Design an enzyme around this catalytic site. Structure first.
Site, mmCIF file in Angstrom:
data_model
loop_
_atom_site.group_PDB
_atom_site.id
_atom_site.type_symbol
_atom_site.label_atom_id
_atom_site.label_comp_id
_atom_site.label_asym_id
_atom_site.label_seq_id
_atom_site.Cartn_x
_atom_site.Cartn_y
_atom_site.Cartn_z
ATOM 1 N N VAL A 1 49.399 37.120 33.720
ATOM 2 C CA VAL A 1 49.179 38.552 33.883
ATOM 3 C C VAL A 1 49.030 38.875 35.358
ATOM 4 C CG1 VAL A 1 48.275 39.293 31.665
ATOM 5 C CG2 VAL A 1 46.748 38.124 33.263
ATOM 6 N N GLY A 2 47.944 38.388 35.943
ATOM 7 C CA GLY A 2 47.580 38.734 37.303
ATOM 8 C C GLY A 2 47.921 37.703 38.359
ATOM 9 N N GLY B 1 46.966 36.854 42.530
ATOM 10 C CA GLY B 1 46.148 37.115 43.698
ATOM 11 C C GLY B 1 46.243 35.943 44.651
ATOM 12 N N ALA B 2 45.646 36.084 45.831
ATOM 13 C CA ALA B 2 45.729 35.050 46.861
ATOM 14 C C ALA B 2 45.080 33.730 46.445
ATOM 15 C CB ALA B 2 45.129 35.549 48.173
ATOM 16 N N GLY C 1 43.831 32.640 43.064
ATOM 17 C CA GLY C 1 44.067 32.037 41.764
ATOM 18 C C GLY C 1 44.888 32.884 40.812
ATOM 19 N N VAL D 1 46.255 34.086 37.113
ATOM 20 C CA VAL D 1 45.506 34.402 35.913
ATOM 21 C C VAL D 1 46.456 34.489 34.730
ATOM 22 C CG1 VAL D 1 43.944 36.015 34.841
ATOM 23 C CG2 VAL D 1 43.963 35.776 37.337
ATOM 24 N N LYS E 1 41.525 32.054 34.586
ATOM 25 C CA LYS E 1 41.872 32.021 36.001
ATOM 26 C C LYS E 1 41.832 30.599 36.532
ATOM 27 C CE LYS E 1 40.749 33.905 40.549
ATOM 28 N NZ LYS E 1 39.834 34.797 41.332
ATOM 29 N N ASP F 1 34.277 40.496 39.726
ATOM 30 C CA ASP F 1 34.484 39.832 41.015
ATOM 31 C C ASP F 1 33.242 39.612 41.874
ATOM 32 O OD1 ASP F 1 37.431 39.682 43.069
ATOM 33 O OD2 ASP F 1 35.462 38.774 43.446
#
Length: 357
Positions: free
Chosen positions: A33-34, A36-37, A39, A41, A56, A171
């Site tokens: 899905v996600g 990011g820098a 990890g 997900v 994650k 977060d």
């Protein structure tokens, strides 16, 4: 009666997002899905509860001593937070059979579905939605602060929302104990408290209140309140609304070589908030006026804000629980990289599965 023995779960491997993911057979139907820098997900079907979860994968948790310490702290905070309006740690695992085999860390949390940014683009929220959204943020924040923790990076992308308008704060990567000589950089420009941006003072938990104010303002008007293009534009945006600060206040919040620049600016008085948020509920406007003040000593707190009349429909002082104080003592130690890593390993291994209810 006590258990003498433990059974390691069975893991399976598969390729996802260009790497091999190795997770307990408990989690099925993984899909990315996600991104990011730090990890990637994946959504997954949690066969233990039958619910969807986010998994994650952290592959650089111990890259340096700085990374390692931060990973340890973040995992402890994650393990600490148990509250309806704060992200919880459903599971944490590693395929490693021993400390020597250890590197990757996987964190499992509830999969919410949208973040507040999504919500904002898809609708103009009613005053009721706003009441309920901000109320939940504040209820979660009261809990976080009561743990002696500052989130430091509240913003719409760190706020998960579902179809029923239920919300959790996400977060804890930047979160710190209040007594820290603060490390880590809060990169978020638009929602960040002025005192943090000025990097002059040891700030308090009300930095998160400022952020809440910026968020609420944005939910009410449908546009970012202070969308600075850089440090200067950000400042002028803020002073425009709140008025330039008295000289006294200046001394505490900026360095001389900043103080001097601020004073260099044309002075402006505090604006009429009613004109900026025209057609907003008058109670909402009043609350914004209590949140968006430069003087962090005068800024309303989470617990105070919950009792504000704007939340009269939702406020329940018997149902706004607090946390145990977080113990940050190990984070004053001076440890090598492998030692921070061993500590993290300990936290993963000691993880206690939340009960089924």
């Amino acid at each position: 009666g006590s258990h003498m023995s433990q059974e390691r779960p069975t893991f399976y491997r598969q390729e996802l997002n260009k790497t091999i993911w190795e997770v307990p057979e408990r989690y099925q139907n993984l899909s990315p899905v996600g991104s990011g820098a730090y990890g990637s997900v994946c959504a997954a079907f949690d066969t233990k509860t039958g619910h969807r979860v986010a998994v994650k994968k952290l592959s650089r948790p111990f890259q340096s001593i700085i990374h390692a310490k931060r990973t340890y702290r973040e995992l402890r905070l994650l393990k600490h937070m148990k509250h309806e309006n704060v992200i919880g740690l459903l599971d944490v695992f590693t395929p490693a059979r021993s400390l020597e085999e250890f590197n990757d860390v996987y964190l499992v949390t509830h999969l919410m579905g949208a973040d507040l940014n999504n919500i904002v683009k898809c609708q103009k929220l009613t005053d009721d939605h706003v009441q309920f959204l901000i109320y939940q943020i504040l209820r979660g924040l009261k809990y976080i602060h009561s743990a002696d923790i500052i989130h430091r990076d509240l913003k719409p992308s760190n706020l998960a929302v579902n179809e029923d308008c239920e919300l959790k704060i996400l977060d804890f990567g930047l979160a710190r104990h209040t007594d820290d000589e603060m490390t880590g950089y809060v990169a978020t420009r638009w929602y960040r408290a002025p005192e943090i941006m000025l990097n002059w003072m040891h700030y308090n938990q009300t930095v998160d209140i400022w952020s809440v104010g910026c968020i609420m303002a944005e939910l009410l008007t449908g546009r970012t309140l202070f969308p600075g293009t850089d440090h200067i534009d950000q400042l002028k945006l803020i002073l425009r609304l709140v008025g330039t600060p008295g000289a006294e206040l200046l001394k505490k919040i900026s360095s001389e070589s900043a103080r001097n620049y601020i004073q260099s600016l044309a002075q402006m008085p505090k604006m009429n908030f009613a004109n900026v948020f025209i057609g907003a509920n008058p109670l909402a406007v009043d609350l914004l006026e209590k949140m968006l003040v430069l003087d962090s000593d005068k800024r309303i707190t989470a617990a105070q804000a919950l009792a504000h009349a704007y939340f009269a429909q939702y406020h329940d002082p018997d149902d706004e629980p607090v946390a145990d104080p977080y113990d940050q003592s190990f984070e004053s130690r001076d440890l090598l990289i492998d030692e921070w890593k061993s500590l993290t390993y300990d936290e993963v291994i000691s993880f206690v599965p939340p009960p089924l209810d």
